[PDB]
């Protein structure tokens, strides 16, 4: 029943502040060390800070000393990361983890992570364009010009999953993301069977259903 | 701080293969070493603790060993669901440090890409931009060459590529190449083509369309 759940992440301006939370269930954080570990886009794992909730003793990575403060409230079984003077370098998925067996079991439980994006760019919802067909046919949707990550794409509201390829987003020279989602289907169904890509960009509260026709 | 030097940076092995990943600590860390597995979009998961102990629920094909400052993760029989990045970590001292990671892909036989080209939608043209998309579907290995030719002229610096993670079912990759032009420039040319070179293709495959036709 052991789990860790991070929250508090999102898009924030450089120079700004943000507080993350880590709620523990299935064990008492008074019993263990709690860590924050982060991972920048396309990079490896970097330890950020540690706390022993019982006495509040802390340790920090050099890269965040002074700017970040880790803390914990045992009565809420929850730990926090106060981030200040945020830099683009701080952009990352932030994970909460614990030391099992006073360190013997290493970091045995991790949360799902919360994405922190540090940028001065404004939120923008995507435009969704059809990739019209012309497993013998291919079709898709171009999900263009949005910020920040992430977006989700499904086909026919989840009814179509086989042969779907939703590509990783790439940052354009404009500083906006763009990606395509494609699927290969029988040519036989091109003139009748309806294909709709469902695009959700929660950061901009944008929801788009686009029908792709031949 | 104590550095963890992990090798190789990446490796491809066929299913059933015995895989070896190495991590060398810059100084003595006793047995305070752990191994983690991380799949795309997911949190790391603990595989091995205290250098050689298999963690709860982890398959028996994973094992760890220590020899002085050298630590070894072994996968006795690589499975398709073992595609991931693996990390060593020491926690003998603070800060705990991670190895650079080892990306493990499944090796399979050559598979030629199925190629498709998509002209820009009329909707997008209205906004004043034209995106042209070339799709390479389900191929292996990952290495491929996609070249855009407009009116039989090599176009450079106007396209970006994206590649999917290795497919869990057939262990293939797919790739998109996207050419972006203004509506004005797009209307100045006729033939739009992507030429694809890949080990699975005897000769380069071209897909093209004529604008307006
Ligand atoms: C893009 O089409 O680049 C090629 C180019 C650039 C400028 C003028 C004409 C052309 N023609 N072509 N190909």
d(CA A108, CA B62): 16
Mark whether A87 and A155 lie in a shared domain.
no
Mark whether B86 and B134 lie in a shared domain.
no
Mark whether A103 and A179 lie in a shared domain.
no
**Residues 6+ positions from A179 with CB-CB distance below 8 Å:** A143, A151, A166, A167, A168, A169, A170, B162
Mark whether B128 and B59 lie in a shared domain.
no
Residue B189 CB–ligand 1 contact under 6 Å: yes
Is the separation of the CB atoms in B172 and B106 below 8 Å?
no
| Neighbouring-strand partners of residue B22 | B7, B72
| SS3 of residue A157 by DSSP | helix
The pairing of beta strand A10-12 with beta strand A114-118: parallel
- Closest chain B C-alpha to A183 CA, distance in angstroms: 9
Mark whether B167 and B93 lie in a shared domain.
no
d(CA A142, CA A195): 14
A138 and chain B in contact, CB less than 8 A: yes
Q: Which two tokens stand for residue A134?
A: 């012309």
Q: Which two tokens stand for residue A195?
A: 């294909």
Is the separation of the CB atoms in A35 and A107 below 8 Å?
yes
- Which of B84, B108, B132 is at the close of a domain? B108
Place of tokens 């998309």: B133
Mark whether B136 and B96 lie in a shared domain.
no
Of B153, B184, B208, best ligand 1 pocket probe by most atoms within 8 Å of the beta carbon: B153
Find the CATH number of the domain harbouring B62.
2.60.40.10
| SS3 of residue A109 by DSSP | strand
DSSP 8-state assignment for residue A193: S
Work out how many domains chain B is built from and give that number. 2
Which residues of chain B have a CB within 8 Å of the CB of A105? 46, 49-50, 55
What technique was this entry resolved by?
X-ray
Q: How far is CA A133 from CA A130, A142, A166, in A?
A: 9, 13, 16
Phi then psi dihedrals of residue B185, to 5 deg: -65, -40
Give the DSSP per-residue string, A32-94: S-EEEEEE-TT---EEEEEEETTTTEEEE-TTTTTTEEEEEEGGGTEEEEEE-S--GGG-EEE
DSSP 8-state assignment for residue A123: P
Mark whether B121 and B203 lie in a shared domain.
yes
Mark whether A107 and A141 lie in a shared domain.
no
Mark whether A98 and A129 lie in a shared domain.
no
Mark whether A76 and A146 lie in a shared domain.
no
CA of B142 to the centre of ligand 1 (A): 30
Place of tokens 């080892």: B102
d(CA A10, CA A17): 11
d(CA A91, CA B117): 35
Find the CATH number of the domain harbouring A155.
2.60.40.10
Strands, sheet with B70-75, edge to edge from the N-terminal-most edge strand: B4-7, B19-25, B70-75, B62-67
**Residues 6+ positions from A158 with CB-CB distance below 8 Å:** none
Mark whether B140 and B155 lie in a shared domain.
yes
Mark whether A97 and A127 lie in a shared domain.
no
Checking chain A for breaks where C and the next N are over 2.5 Å apart, the residues before them are: 134
Mark whether B162 and B190 lie in a shared domain.
yes
Work out how many domains chain A is built from and give that number. 2
Sign of CA dihedral A39, A43, A45, A48: negative
Give the 3-state DSSP-derived string for chain B, with helices as H, strands as E and coil as C. Answer: CCCEEEECCEEEECCCCCEEEEEEECCCCCCCEEEEEECCCCCCEEEEECCCEECCCCCCCEEEEEECCEEEEEECCCCHHHCEEEEEEECCCCCCEECCCEEEEECCCCECCEEEEECCCHHHHHHCEEEEEEEEEEEECCCCEEEEEECCEEECCCEEEEECCCCCCCCCEEEEEEEEEEHHHHCCCCEEEEEEECCCCCCCEEEEEECCC
The domain of A151 spans: 121-214
- Which of A74, A95, A120 is at the close of a domain? A120
- Which of B87, B108, B129 is at the close of a domain? B108
CB-nearest to B43 from A44, A50, A111 is A111
Q: What burial class does residue B150 get, using C-beta atoms within 10 Å of its C-beta: 0-12 exposed, 13-18 middle, 19+ buried?
A: buried
Sign of CA dihedral B182, B136, A40, B43: positive
- Closest chain A C-alpha to B142 CA, distance in angstroms: 14
The domain of B78 spans: 1-108
Mark whether B129 and B101 lie in a shared domain.
no
d(CA B144, CA B174): 10
Q: Which two tokens stand for residue B43?
A: 């949190």
d(CA B154, CA B12): 33
Is the separation of the CB atoms in A148 and A124 below 8 Å?
no
**Residue (of B123, B134, B17, B23) closest to B73 by Cα position:** B23
Q: How far is CA B209 from CA A124, A140, B132, B186, in A?
A: 32, 17, 10, 13
**Residue (of A121, A138, A122, A139) closest to A130 by Cα position:** A139
């Amino acid at each position: 029943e052991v789990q860790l759940v991070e929250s508090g992440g999102g898009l924030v301006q450089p120079g700004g502040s943000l507080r993350l939370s880590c709620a523990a269930s299935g064990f008492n954080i008074k019993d263990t060390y709690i860590h924050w570990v982060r991972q920048a886009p396309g990079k490896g794992l970097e330890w950020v800070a540690r706390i022993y909730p019982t006495n509040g003793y802390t340790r920090y990575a050099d890269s965040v000393k002074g700017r970040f403060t880790i803390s914990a409230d045992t009565s809420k079984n929850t730990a926090y990361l106060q981030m200040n003077s945020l830099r683009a370098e701080d952009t990352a998925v932030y994970y909460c983890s614990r030391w099992g067996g006073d360190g013997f079991y290493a970091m045995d439980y991790w949360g799902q992570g919360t994405l922190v994006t540090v940028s001065s760019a404004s939120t923008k919802g995507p435009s969704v364009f059809p990739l019209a067909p012309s497993g013998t046919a291919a079709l898709g949707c171009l999900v263009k010009d949005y910020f920040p990550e992430p977006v989700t794409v499904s086909w026919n509201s989840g009814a179509l999953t086989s042969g779907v390829h939703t590509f990783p987003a790439v940052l354009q020279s404009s500083g906006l993301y763009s990606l395509s989602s494609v699927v290969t289907v029988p040519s036989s169904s091109l003139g009748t069977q309806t294909y709709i890509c469902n695009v959700n960009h929660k950061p901009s509260n944008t929801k788009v259903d686009k029908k792709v026709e031949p | 701080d104590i550095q963890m030097t992990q090798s190789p940076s990446s490796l491809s092995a066929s299913v059933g293969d015995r895989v070896t990943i190495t991590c060398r600590a810059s100084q003595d860390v006793n047995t305070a070493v752990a191994w983690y597995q991380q799949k795309p979009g997911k949190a790391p998961k603990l595989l091995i603790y205290s250098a050689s102990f298999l963690y709860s629920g982890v398959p028996s094909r994973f094992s760890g060993s220590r020899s002085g400052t050298d630590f070894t993760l072994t996968i006795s029989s690589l499975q398709p669901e073992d595609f991931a990045t693996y990390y060593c970590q020491q926690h003998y001292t603070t800060p705990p440090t991670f190895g650079q990671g080892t990306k493990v892909e499944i090796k399979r036989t050559v598979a030629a890409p199925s190629v498709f080209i998509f002209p820009p939608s009329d909707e997008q043209l209205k906004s004043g931009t034209a995106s042209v998309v070339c799709l390479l579907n389900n191929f292996y290995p990952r290495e491929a060459k996609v070249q855009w030719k407009v009116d039989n002229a090599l176009k450079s610096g106007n396209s970006q590529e994206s590649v999917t993670e290795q497919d869990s079912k057939d262990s293939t990759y797919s790739l998109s190449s996207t050419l972006t032009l203004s509506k004005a420039d797009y209307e100045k040319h006729k033939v739009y083509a992507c030429e694809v070179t890949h080990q699975g293709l005897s000769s380069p495959v071209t897909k093209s369309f004529n604008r307006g036709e």
